[PDB]
Design a protein around this ligand. Sequence first.
Ligand SMILES: [Zn+2]
Length: 135
Amino acid sequence: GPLGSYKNNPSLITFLCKNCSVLACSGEDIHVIEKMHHVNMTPEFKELYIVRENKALQKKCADYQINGEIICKCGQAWGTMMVHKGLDLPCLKIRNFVVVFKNNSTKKQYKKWVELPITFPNLDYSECCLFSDED
Ligand SMILES: [Zn+2]
């Protein structure tokens, strides 16, 4: 049975690949930016996703330089690889991922992180302005 308490913990939930369903990362293993942008500051995840050479995604004239479109092993557009002055911030899309609850044996498929009733942390990359070398 369930016999649980709360389910608003990103520790019980995890992200998977829609196409497949491989654990790419966990909610708790994710950071938020102004609760407006979802950036996955996971290094190990860099070995779970592959970027393909495509300009159909990234753009020159912009403020957020992208590398292309991130895709799982199978090749499922996990989202996109955003860059900030040379930073690495992979923006995944729940519309390409899945959410599996640990508390109870179930699998919920969302579209946006906003749909996630689970509360997330708040990590402001800007916090560090050291690396800042460019103008
Ligand atoms: Zn896959």
